Design a protein around this ligand. Structure first.
Ligand SMILES: *[C@@H]1O[C@H](CO)[C@@H](O[C@@H]2O[C@H](CO)[C@@H](O)[C@H](O)[C@H]2NC(C)=O)[C@H](O)[C@H]1NC(C)=O
Ligand SMILES: *[C@@H]1O[C@H](CO)[C@@H](O[C@@H]2O[C@H](CO)[C@@H](O)[C@H](O)[C@H]2NC(C)=O)[C@H](O)[C@H]1NC(C)=O
Ligand SMILES: *[C@@H]1O[C@H](CO)[C@@H](O)[C@H](O)[C@H]1NC(C)=O
Ligand SMILES: *[C@@H]1O[C@H](CO)[C@@H](O)[C@H](O)[C@H]1NC(C)=O
Ligand code: NA
Ligand code: NA
Ligand code: NA
Ligand code: NA
Ligand SMILES: [Zn+2]
Length: 856
């Protein structure tokens, strides 16, 4: 008879300090712990509720120069709680200490205190143990008040064999031999922090280190065979840590910061205070083999994790309904920091693309407000999504533009200073921002309702009429305070207008030839132009496209196709606009063009539409052919030029543009004749391998080199190529082997499943594999995880028939408690519903447009 019936812990028993002793055995794969937690009670009680999950509690006692007594233990596994019953009611305000002894098995998933393995370059299997606790898995490693507002200090001790190294949040202060072959490591006490930030790793990692100008020792740890790839991340971390310390004027408060590359890791990285963790591919850099995309990705990932030391660790959201205060800010700070520390990366131009990814899900009924209630672990994991990360960063960027960078920076500094070592709510951020303007009323419209507005512009002479309405595919009365911006043919000053009502008007000083709203796409909204608007802007792009900025051109491309879905613009007119790209040069507008047009043939690929699919792909290649032909088969140029080269050559080869295929075939044959020892330009390797893997001999040869590669980029490039074969038996093998995790690690499975889901002949196999192996995949990755969401959407969200829709509805319906209520399931259902309507309306229009298409 359990005495607590709520998922949320009681509020009146509060921890102050934890002493954690962990003794793990990396041979038996078990661990023992003793947890002592200093607590004080706000009000008298005789029961203490806390979290524990899959931990066998052997004994629990309560300690008051005096006194100690036993506690009865009850468990409620579904609430993931245990209850400790005291003989006497606890006394208010007096310090107690709860001592719990327990045992567990190392987790075989990617969360909790889990097993990771790797093979030495000689073939020896090695075992390590690592942690991943965010959001609710600390309770799988020690019993705790496992909610992020129950902050405390942590003194961690690790018992281990002499052959192993242990690291944790804080520096090692002492090692004591306790028994024959057993050493006890004492780490220094942490600052006050949430339980999800606790971390420890038992490994044989090696490290390299560098000291910041502020005296912080920064280290990168990795397996011995890969530590020579740590130099780039080490240098970036020192630079970025120094940047944030100087930017926030709040020092990093710990003596050291570690970045650890874990051989098995579910996400990309995690911000544990003093001991940040990473997938090997997100941290390690090979100067000969790593891609430009990889260098960018490592830099931004490190910038994200180090931003979290302030936005997340120092200041933490009070509850997961406001996770965006962690994740939106860390995502935004990636661009603030890296635009200064690595200007050659030009990260600023990539930002708006995240906003368009957020708008993809946020246009659906099944989106949710940035701030929204959650209760159980699955729901909490679902908050780590494009709304929290990307919409969060996008509305912060919009607010920064509205307030000015200086007022925004003063706001976030006051916010961080005032709430240091505490927790914040949505409202606390607005109050800090206003202390520098009714920010609260405005930002409440952007955080407490889902979606975004369509802004409709109607011009009569000098009179510019504006209307807002909720953009939904494909009428709730939603209203926003929208900080509009515009430029005109007569003024490229960024003009501002705060639209607070359904309609409003502004008067231009003189008539203009065109007007363009949402300058640089810094606003989280889309724009429709009535009357001759889209013709006028289409003419601008086709005549003098440089009359507006690259990012303004990308915004026009994106918005035109979004307006097709709600019937405000014909597919023919949006496709007509896209034709200006034949004269475009810039990565962002070209990338945006690809990102609007590729998804159209991805729908056709899953239909009996080979004729139009082939003509559409030939149109795409012809549209970009001049740019394709100018690409050199080298690694020259900027990061943007290199990413553009790699993507264009891949596109051209996969769609059988013969000049590219023939050159890629030659490089692959030479690479194979060299026994895989030939150094190819990294930027052409995706295309070369993707062509090579189309034959059985080439696929088999590529796979044979995957075993021995120490390069994350090369393994990623091989994986992509292997997933592109039309040989169904090979596709099935990849699914089976990465599912098993021996020949290909299970951390790659979600990406392999999705790539095969996008394969024009493999997509039935991937959806089938997901259905057949659902229960084991959920057990490995967890309901609500981003990984499960990626697998659900990546195998299903390009279907466009009523028969496929019912397959999806019927399958997930049948799962009941094991998945039927997933948000990603409702999102993919609504996406397929929109695909059905969009294809039913537009397919014949596209077919005719392509035939008429003599412009090319
Ligand atoms: C760790 O795994 C072992 C599996 O061997 C679990 O031990 C079994 O538990 C059941 C039920 O309690 C017993 O009937 C078996 O006899 C146990 N097996 C052995 C070999 O002793 C153990 O419960 C797991 N630990 C936790 C904390 O879940
Ligand atoms: C993990 O367990 C193994 C065995 O269960 C421990 O290995 C023993 O270590 C002692 C002293 O080092 C040796 O005398 C025994 O011969 C070992 N037994 C075996 C089967 O190898 C190991 O020390 C444990 N490690 C930890 C960290 O607890
Ligand atoms: C959106 O979902 C809600 C509840 O799920 C429903 O009441 C509403 O009708 C939906 N909107 C549309 C356009 O289907
Ligand atoms: C080719 O093999 C040599 C000898 O083992 C090695 O040193 C070199 O790095 C290899 N080159 C590539 C591109 O793999
Ligand atoms: Na556990
Ligand atoms: Na909103
Ligand atoms: Na939203
Ligand atoms: Na249309
Ligand atoms: Zn984050």
């Amino acid at each position: 008879p359990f005495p607590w019936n709520k998922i949320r812990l009681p509020e009146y028993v509060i921890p102050v300090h934890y002493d954690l002793l962990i003794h793990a055995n990396l041979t038996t794969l078990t661990f023992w712990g003793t947890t002592k937690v200093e607590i004080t009670a706000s009000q008298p009680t005789s029961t203490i509720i806390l979290h524990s999950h899959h931990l066998q509690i052997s004994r629990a006692t309560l300690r008051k120069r005096l006194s100690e007594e036993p506690l009865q233990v009850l468990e409620h596994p579904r609430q993931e709680q245990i209850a400790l019953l005291a003989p006497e009611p606890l006394l208010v305000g007096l310090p107690y200490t709860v001592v719990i002894h327990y045992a567990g098995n190392l987790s075989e998933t990617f969360h909790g205190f889990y097993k990771s393995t790797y093979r030495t370059k000689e073939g020896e299997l090695r075992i390590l143990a690592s942690t991943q606790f965010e959001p609710t898995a600390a309770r799988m490693a020690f019993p705790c008040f496992d909610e992020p507002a129950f902050k405390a200090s942590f003194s961690i001790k690790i018992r281990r064999e002499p052959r192993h190294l242990a690291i944790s949040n804080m520096p090692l202060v002492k090692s004591v031999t306790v028994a024959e072959g057993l050493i006890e490591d004492h780490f220094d006490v942490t600052v006050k922090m949430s339980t999800y930030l606790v971390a420890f790793i038992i490994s044989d990692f090696e490290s390299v280190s560098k000291i910041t100008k502020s005296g912080v020792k920064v280290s990168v740890y990795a397996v011995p065979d890969k530590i020579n790839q740590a130099d780039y991340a080490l240098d970036a971390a020192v630079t970025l840590l120094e940047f944030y310390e100087d930017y926030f004027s709040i020092p990093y408060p710990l003596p050291k910061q570690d970045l650890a590359a874990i051989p098995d890791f579910q996400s990309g990285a995690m911000e544990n205070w003093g001991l940040t963790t990473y997938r090997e591919s997100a941290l390690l850099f090979d100067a000969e083999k790593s891609s430009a995309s990889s260098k960018l990705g490592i830099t931004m990932t490190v910038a994200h994790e180090l931003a979290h030391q302030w936005f997340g660790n120092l200041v933490t959201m009070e509850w997961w309904n406001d996770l965006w205060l962690n994740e939106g800010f860390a995502k935004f700070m990636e661009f603030v920091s890296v635009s200064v520390t690595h200007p050659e990366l030009k990260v600023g131009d990539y930002f708006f693309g995240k906003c368009f990814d957020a708008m993809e899900v946020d246009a659906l009924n099944s989106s949710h407000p940035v701030s929204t209630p959650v209760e159980n672990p699955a729901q909490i994991r679902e908050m780590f999504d494009d709304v929290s990360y990307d919409k969060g960063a996008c509305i912060l960027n919009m607010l920064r533009e509205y307030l000015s960078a200086d007022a925004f920076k003063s706001g976030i500094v006051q916010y961080l200073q005032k709430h240091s070592y505490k927790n914040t709510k949505n409202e606390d951020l607005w109050d800090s921002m206003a202390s520098i303007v009714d920010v609260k009323t405005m930002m409440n419209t952007w955080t407490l309702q889902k979606g975004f507005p369509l802004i409709t512009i109607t011009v009569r002479g000098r009179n510019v009429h504006m209307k807002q309405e909720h953009y939904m595919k494909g009428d709730t009365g939603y209203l926003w305070h929208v900080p509009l911006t515009f430029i005109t043919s007569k003024s490229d000053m960024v003009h501002r207008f705060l639209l607070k009502t359904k309609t409003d008007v502004l008067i231009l000083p003189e008539e203009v030839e065109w007007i363009k709203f949402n300058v640089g796409m810094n606003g989280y909204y889309i724009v429709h132009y009535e009357d001759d608007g889209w013709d006028s802007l289409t003419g601008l792009l086709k005549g003098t496209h440089t009359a507006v900025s690259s990012n303004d051109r990308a915004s026009l491309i994106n918005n035109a196709f979004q307006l097709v879905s709600i019937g405000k613009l014909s597919i023919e007119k949006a496709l007509d606009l896209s034709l200006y790209l034949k004269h475009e040069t810039e990565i962002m507008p070209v990338f945006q063009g690809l990102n609007e047009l590729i998804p159209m043939y991805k729908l056709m690929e899953k239909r009996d539409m080979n004729e139009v699919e082939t003509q559409f792909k030939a149109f795409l290649i012809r549209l970009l052919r001049d740019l394709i032909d100018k690409q050199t088969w080298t690694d020259e140029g900027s990061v943007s030029e290199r990413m553009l080269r790699s993507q264009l050559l891949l596109l051209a080869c996969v769609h059988n543009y013969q000049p590219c295929v023939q050159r890629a075939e030659g490089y692959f044959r030479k690479w194979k004749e060299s026994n895989g020892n030939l150094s190819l330009p990294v930027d052409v390797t995706l295309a070369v391998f993707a062509v090579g893997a189309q034959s059985t001999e080439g696929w088999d040869f590529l796979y044979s080199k995957y075993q021995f590669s120490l390069s994350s980029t090369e393994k990623s490039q091989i994986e992509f190529a292997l997933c592109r074969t039309q040989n169904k038996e090979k596709l099935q093998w990849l699914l089976d082997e990465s599912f098993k995790g021996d020949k290909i690690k299970t951390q790659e499975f979600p990406q392999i499943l999705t790539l095969i889901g996008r394969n024009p002949v493999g997509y039935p196999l991937a959806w089938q594999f997901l259905r057949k192996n659902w229960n084991k995949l959920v057990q490995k990755f967890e309901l609500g995880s981003s990984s499960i969401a990626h697998m659900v959407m990546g195998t299903t969200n390009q279907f466009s028939t009523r028969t496929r829709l019912e397959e999806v509805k019927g399958f997930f319906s049948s799962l009941k408690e094991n998945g039927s209520q997933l948000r990603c399931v409702q999102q993919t259902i609504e996406t397929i519903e929109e695909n059905i309507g969009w294809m039913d309306k537009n397919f014949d229009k596209i077919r005719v447009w392509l035939q008429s298409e003599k412009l090319r």
